[PDB]
Amino acid sequence: DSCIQFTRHASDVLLNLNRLRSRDILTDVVIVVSREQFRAHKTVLMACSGLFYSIFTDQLKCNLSVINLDPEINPEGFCILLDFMYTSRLNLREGNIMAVMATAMYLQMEHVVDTCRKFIKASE
Amino acid sequence: DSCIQFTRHASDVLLNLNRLRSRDILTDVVIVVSREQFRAHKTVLMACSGLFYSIFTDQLKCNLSVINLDPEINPEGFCILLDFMYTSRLNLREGNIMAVMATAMYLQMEHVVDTCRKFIKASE
Amino acid sequence: WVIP
Amino acid sequence: WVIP
Ligand SMILES: O=C1Cc2cc(Nc3ncncc3Cl)ccc2N1
Numbered sequence: 252d253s254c255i256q257f258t259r260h261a262s263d264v265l266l267n268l269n270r271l272r273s274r275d276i277l278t279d280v281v282i283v284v285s286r287e288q289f290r291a292h293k294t295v296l297m298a299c300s301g302l303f304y305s306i307f308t309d310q311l312k313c314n315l316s317v318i319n320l321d322p323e324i325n326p327e328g329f330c331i332l333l334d335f336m337y338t339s340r341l342n343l344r345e346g347n348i349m350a351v352m353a354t355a356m357y358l359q360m361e362h363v364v365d366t367c368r369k370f371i372k373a374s375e
Numbered sequence: 376d377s378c379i380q381f382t383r384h385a386s387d388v389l390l391n392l393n394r395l396r397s398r399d400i401l402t403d404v405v406i407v408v409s410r411e412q413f414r415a416h417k418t419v420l421m422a423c424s425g426l427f428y429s430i431f432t433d434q435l436k437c438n439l440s441v442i443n444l445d446p447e448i449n450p451e452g453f454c455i456l457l458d459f460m461y462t463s464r465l466n467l468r469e470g471n472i473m474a475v476m477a478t479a480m481y482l483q484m485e486h487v488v489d490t491c492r493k494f495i496k497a498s499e
Numbered sequence: 500w501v502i503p
Numbered sequence: 504w505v506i507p
């Protein structure tokens with residue numbers, strides 16, 4: 252087509268979605284991790300994670316307001332990944348990289364799994 | 376902080392939100408314009424428009440599944456703006472610029488109003 | 500704004 | 504990935 256494009260539009264949308272998350276506006280699901288609860292927007296979780304995409308496209312699970320993650324999932328690793336979903340920023344540290352990579356593999360967040368693999372390989 | 380950032384994350388999120396819109400997945404509102412109906416995600420509309428932000432933060436209107444726009448709003452102008460919300464791409468043409476600017480002013484989409492004003496000024 |  |  253002959254469209255024009257606003258460079259900062261996608262980033263501004265994500266910034267506003269994160270502001271809605273902060274203020275708990277229109278959040279429609281609770282993610283339960285080892286008895287730690289995280290409120291979020293189903294559509295943002297689907298847009299970021301192959302696991303959530305599969306969960307919320309299921310005809311029965313699409314209607315659930317609570318999703319319980321596998322007990323092996325670490326709440327801090329989940330929190331870091333949820334922050335990444337809403338900001339594009341990943342708080343990757345020596346002390347959390349193993350939990351973050353394991354959580355990203357489970358959530359099916361391929362780009363995160365990729366940078367974790369590379370950061371681990373650099374330290375070996 | 377000491378975060379790393381994935382450059383394409385925000386664009387990939389918006390692309391996936393538009394794929395959900397195309398497939399009518401988790402859309403939670405119908406916008407009615409001069410008897411033309413548009414399905415969308417409330418959170419995306421809020422993230423893009425000062426008008427929708429004000430509508431869906433209202434304690435009564437946040438629960439509506441149908442929103443009727445002012446009868447002066449042109450369905451094509453709305454359609455172009457809805458596409459922009461989900462893609463960052465604006466199909467601005469000599470034949471639609473007046474309707475697009477009028478719709479963007481009503482929806483409170485300041486960056487769109489800005490480029491329309493500039494494109495109109497260049498033709499005078 | 501840019502030409503994409 | 505970049506340093507923001
Ligand atoms: O690594 C990843 C990130 C990711 C996101 C999604 N999401 C969607 N894919 C396609 N159409 C719509 C949506 Cl919402 C699916 C798989 C994966 N895998």
Ligand SMILES: O=C1Cc2cc(Nc3ncncc3Cl)ccc2N1
Binds near residue numbers: 267421422423428486
């Ligand atoms: O031009 C514009 C675009 C736009 C978006 C919104 N959205 C939000 N603002 C702040 N926190 C959350 C959200 Cl969702 C409000 C006003 C305007 N005005």
Ligand SMILES: [Cl-]
Binds near residue numbers: 361
């Ligand atoms: Cl990812």
Ligand SMILES: [Cl-]
Binds near residue numbers: 484486488
């Ligand atoms: Cl705008």
